[PDB]
């Protein structure tokens, strides 16, 4: 169970599946989730802080 949860957590930042462990920033994943919720139209004034 702990390995399962760790793998679930680590899969969020995995950029590709066919090769090595290439990662993306967590903020990029958060921005993708935000775009899924609603299409963001203010690119300059990002306030993820």
């Amino acid at each position: 169970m702990t390995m399962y949860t760790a793998s679930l957590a680590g899969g969020i930042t995995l950029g590709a599946l066919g090769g090595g462990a290439v990662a993306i920033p967590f903020a990029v994943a958060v921005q993708a989730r935000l775009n899924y919720v609603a299409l963001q139209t203010d690119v300059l004034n990002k306030n993820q802080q």
């Binding site: 919720v37 609603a38 299409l39 963001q40 139209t41």
Partner: protein, 44 residues
């Protein structure tokens, strides 16, 4: 908006965006609660 330009926003989050002609469907009739406009005022 203030400049009489039509905008579209989702209801989950306020993310206004400019409206284009491809976002609309044309129908014959009109409703009472529709905003009146001419060809010039229509979105580009």
């Amino acid at each position: 908006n203030l400049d009489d330009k039509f905008y579209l926003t989702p209801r989950t989050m306020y993310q206004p965006r400019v409206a284009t002609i491809s976002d609309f469907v044309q129908i014959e009739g009109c409703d009472v609660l529709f905003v009146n406009a001419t060809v010039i005022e229509l979105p580009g």
